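Re: magnesium ion structure - here you go.
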Amino acid sequence: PKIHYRKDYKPSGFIINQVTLNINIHDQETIVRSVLDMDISKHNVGEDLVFDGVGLKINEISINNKKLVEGEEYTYDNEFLTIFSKFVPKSKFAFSSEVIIHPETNYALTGLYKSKNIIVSQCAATGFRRITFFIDRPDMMAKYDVTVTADKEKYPVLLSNGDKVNEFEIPGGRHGARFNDPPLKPCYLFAVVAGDLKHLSATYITKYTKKKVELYVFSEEKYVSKLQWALECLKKSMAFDEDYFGLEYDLSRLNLVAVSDFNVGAMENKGLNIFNANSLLASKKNSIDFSYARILTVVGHEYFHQYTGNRVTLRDWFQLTLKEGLTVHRENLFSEEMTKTVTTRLSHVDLLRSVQFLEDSSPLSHPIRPESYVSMENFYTTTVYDKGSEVMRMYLTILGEEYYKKGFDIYIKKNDGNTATCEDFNYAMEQAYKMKKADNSANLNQYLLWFSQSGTPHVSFKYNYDAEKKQYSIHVNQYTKPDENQKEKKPLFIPISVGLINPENGKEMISQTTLELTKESDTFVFNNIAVKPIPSLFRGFSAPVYIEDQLTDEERILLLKYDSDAFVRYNSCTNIYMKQILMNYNEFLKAKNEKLESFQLTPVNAQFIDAIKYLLEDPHADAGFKSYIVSLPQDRYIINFVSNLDTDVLADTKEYIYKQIGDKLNDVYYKMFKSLEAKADDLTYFNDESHVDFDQMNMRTLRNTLLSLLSKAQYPNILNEIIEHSKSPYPSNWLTSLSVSAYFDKYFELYDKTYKLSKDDELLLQEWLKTVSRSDRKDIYEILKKLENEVLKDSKNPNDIRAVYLPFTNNLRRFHDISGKGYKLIAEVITKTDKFNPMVATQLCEPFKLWNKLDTKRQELMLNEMNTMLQEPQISNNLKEYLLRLTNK
Ligand SMILES: [Mg+2]
Ligand SMILES: [Mg+2]
Ligand SMILES: [Mg+2]
Ligand SMILES: [Zn+2]
């Protein structure tokens, strides 16, 4: 297993100037002919010419139109094509090859593969080498001339990068299309699509140069009517990058294509973006509400790659966070602007502090720029993407809007036409930092630690107020736990957006202020503070850290009620919950360990429950925010604060706290569920697929959250509401009616009802699968068996497999069953999946990421299943590397 090291980067001894591709698709094989116009680079030292080439069947290879002989002049081991340097010319030359590949049986969904009735490529690192021979690394820039031929009846629509310069007929009912793409690009931005695609189209006119841009969104014929929202989202994306960043689309056409089989969300190939169907297709009748924000962010994301990707490429894959973190950051700015709901930012923080914090405190912990990798595909992680995005976002927080845009422009201009690194972006931002500080000696050298240092920093506070001096002090401390990546952790540049709330009236006491913590500790003093304030810390979640506010619950309640920052209100609520959770957990644990016949639990803070009631009953308050405050923190957020987590005890803890709050608020919950109906379920624009109301969807989120709370609490006659809810036109609603019906005898009745509603839409059925999979049922294991036998079967569709199993793994009581039954089940699925799709198999390992955080028994059970998976003879390199790092072996 070869390990690639970041510090070992060296430019190739070769150059690939021109790529000329002929891709001939047939019924049971695809023939690929390729001519590479190559040269010797200045870094060449007479080494062998080595191409990446995975799973290629060689018909012939040549240098300068002369066939190479195997064994004497070259060797190929199904992974690397080695051509002995004596047969490699010392000047310009042409390498040519003809290989056979088989997209029909490419179930790994990387390289060229068949998804239902569409042939599509997926090259983003390591993929292009599965189509033909290449020096498959992002610093190898080349020009592309691509011809695609296929059966005209099966594949009338042919797409690739650049301009379609020729279309022609071929004997045998075949046809061809030539695409020439003159600008240099890396091979991971290459793409080809073939199929019976239908489209929606539109024309977009750019802001400044007035260039008309053709916009096409593609899908199979059956779901072509589900393309409208994506088209609108694409329009929004282009406008935003124009309005915010001043950037126009460079080409005359942009294609979006949905395919049913896809490992991730999407890919951003130049002028041709390719999407997981679940992230491009939606309709009001056939999609849950979540799809609309999903399509918005993903379409936006892949579009924001276009301008930067056109000018600035990654030097190497260790720089992945530079393009992914930055693009997710741009995607998030976009989404917040488009949704105009505080829950957009809250949802990204919620994901980071659950999933990414878990990752960063696990043995899989890595910095956003890793020092090494075995399988590049294994580092498309929430750390690289989402912590990466937060690191990118901190630049904006530090610099402010005006100087951030200045820094961004410097980045593009300085690095236009070349490859770049994380250091290049930091340098550009440093120039803006100098300008802002009016100080040419200012620098962001320390900031680089955000790229190199793994682990989540802990930030804690102490306060002092001098009533006579009107003087307020915030003492801050930062600390990152040592891990297997760095022995000694260094202090980071931590930007702390703060406000000061007057507890007497809820007013702001100081202007916008961002504290710059650059040391292990510092004391920030504020003069002319007329009264002892309550600090509002890390507004907007201004740094990706553990926040320890050291406030009382009284102070936290006041922030929750009166603070202006949505995140700090949300965090204060979170902190109140966590204090309660840790307290009741330990009480439950102690009772269990000592086998007590009787014991006490500390009740939920009465004033806290009062505050929740207050917010819930406020008409001017946000429905989405309301849904957060009545929900306990994510289990994966909680587990970061508990050693040897007994999942049963946590389940008991959560149940007690929900019951405590419900005993007081259930009538308020029921009242709101009824009063919210009219606005939440309004059908006025149900058949207008361009009309998306994010506030309204949040009202539905609130209703469905309340309905779940009332169902679990067995509220009197709530089953009546549940049944009527099942009749709603909105899938978010009637799928909710299924999962909340779990506590009733009507479950399998609604099981069958909602299945029939879902079965005729591929994506909708997958949402139904998720709902069933997540259903709080005691017979969930039998139910999963039913799904396998009756619905899933031997599907190799990642959307199908993930939908059936992943939500189940969040079942705190059932997945973590003490017999290890759940661990065994998922391991079997992982091993089964790894046979045809290593990446998705690695995805299905996610439950095990917390293995060393559980109680000793469950650690043992999980560890056994992982070692069992590790012992599989046919285990992939992806899965092997992942499990080896996770098990610290
Ligand atoms: Mg092959
Ligand atoms: Mg969907
Ligand atoms: Mg980019
Ligand atoms: Zn991306």
